[PDB]
Amino acid sequence: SGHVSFAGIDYPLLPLNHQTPLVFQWFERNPDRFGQNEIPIINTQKNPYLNNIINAAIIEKERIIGIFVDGDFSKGQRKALGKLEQNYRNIKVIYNSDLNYSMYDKKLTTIYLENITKLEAQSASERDEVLLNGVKKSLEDVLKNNPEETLISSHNKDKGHLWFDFYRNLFLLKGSDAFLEAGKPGCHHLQPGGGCIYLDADMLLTDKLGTLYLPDGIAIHVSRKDNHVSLENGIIAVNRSEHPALIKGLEIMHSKPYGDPYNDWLSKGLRHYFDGSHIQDYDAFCDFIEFKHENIIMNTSSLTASSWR
Ligand SMILES: CC(=O)N[C@H]1[C@@H](OP(=O)(O)OP(=O)(O)OC[C@H]2O[C@@H](n3ccc(=O)[nH]c3=O)[C@H](O)[C@@H]2O)O[C@H](CO)[C@@H](O)[C@@H]1O
Ligand SMILES: [Mn+2]
Ligand SMILES: [Mn+2]
């Protein structure tokens, strides 16, 4: 087929051709745990993530493979990453410090003040007074510690998995263009305003992916463990920059206090985008949105060990 229907609307199954880059991510909170000439990406027996990435680059020879990294890497470590790119010409190491996300950002005071106003406009007998008090306390904390804290500055390395989860969604907003904005060479055959296929480093390719067809050009991982189905992070495929489903999620992150990249940006953003009146089941949405591929063994860490839990 060439279209699918969901919540009463028809959506074309849009192509992500074999150009569309794959993107892995490695945000490293403690790069001093690697040798100062070692590639600072986990590569243990239980988490063989650099090998998995290399193995994907070998399989997907004709396609760019981005590694989206962050952390306080040594010069020697950056040179080891440069050497990886020499050894596998399709790998492009993108430093999160080389991208500008200011167009997506918002001050935490602003979010808190907007939520306080809205709550105080509601009657005392109507409103969520516990929330109102929680938000006023978050505001006090920010004003005391760092008044200029923003959504983005707040999702830093000190926040565990929130650091990489938040920045992953930001990178997906940029899409293919992030390769160009970070000054990566040999990325000029990427489509301008193009998309990418984000994969967790334990999503093992066993053979080429080829051309993908996704509804409205978007799809996400679903777990089926079991008998059980949920949206999951860990595969995010888009055919274009600023996918409106992801923009919708960002609007939720800008209006909610305590917005979560998984629960709010990704899950509610997508579901509110494709099924805003909530007329169809969640399991049906999972089926509609599911990234399916027979040449990926998905989430292999859950059969071994989590790299951060
Ligand atoms: C549910 C699922 O199928 N995958 C998610 C799961 O990972 P899970 O719990 O499955 O953990 P994994 O070991 O697969 O690591 C997932 C990914 O997180 C990133 N990573 C991990 C550790 C680290 O120090 N630095 C780093 O950047 C990497 O991109 C890695 O690929 O929870 C993570 C944290 O909410 C999400 O990010 C993953 O998308
Ligand atoms: Mn089903
Ligand atoms: Mn995993």
Residue numbers in the entry: 40 to 348
Which sentences did the original study use to describe this structure?
The non-LEE encoded effector protein B (NleB) has GT activity and inhibits NF-κB activation by transferring N-acetyl glucosamine (GlcNAc) to host death domain-containing proteins and to glyceraldehyde 3-phosphate dehydrogenase (GAPDH). The glycosylation target is an arginine residue, which was unexpected because the guanidine group of arginine is nucleophilically poor at physiological pH. The T3SS effectors SseK1 and SseK2 from Salmonella typhimurium SL1344 are NleB orthologs that behave as NleB1-like GTs, although they differ in protein substrate specificity. Here, by using a combination of X-ray crystallography, STD-NMR, enzyme kinetics, molecular dynamics simulations, and in vivo experiments, we show that these enzymes are GT-A fold retaining GTs that most likely follow an SNi mechanism.
Based on the complexes of SseK2 with UDP and UDP-GlcNAc, we identified the donor-substrate binding mode and substrate-mediated conformational changes. The uridine group has an aromatic ring tethered by Phe203 and Trp65 through π-π stacking, water-mediated indirect hydrogen bonds (backbones of Arg68 and Ser346), and hydrogen bonding with the Phe66 backbone. The GlcNAc moiety of UDP-GlcNAc establishes hydrogen bond interactions with Asp204, Arg207, Asp239, and Arg348. The acetyl group of GlcNAc stabilizes the manganese ion by water-mediated hydrogen bonds. An octahedral molecular geometry was visualized for the manganese ion coordinated to six oxygens from the UDP pyrophosphate, Asp241, Ser340, Asn338, and a water molecule. The SseK2 structure undergoes a dramatic conformational change induced by donor-substrate binding. After UDP-GlcNAc binds to the active site, the α10 helix is tilted towards the UDP-GlcNAc by ~ 3.5° and the C-terminal lid domain covers up the active site to stabilize the bound substrate and to restrict the accessibility of water molecules. The closure of the C-terminal lid in the presence of UDP-GlcNAc determines a closed conformation for this family of enzymes. In the SseK2-UDP-GlcNAc crystal structure (chain D), Asn272 (corresponding to Asn256SseK1) is closer to the C1 anomeric carbon of UDP-GlcNAc (5.1 Å) as compared to Glu271 (5.6 Å). These data indicate that the Asn272 may play an important role in binding and catalysis.
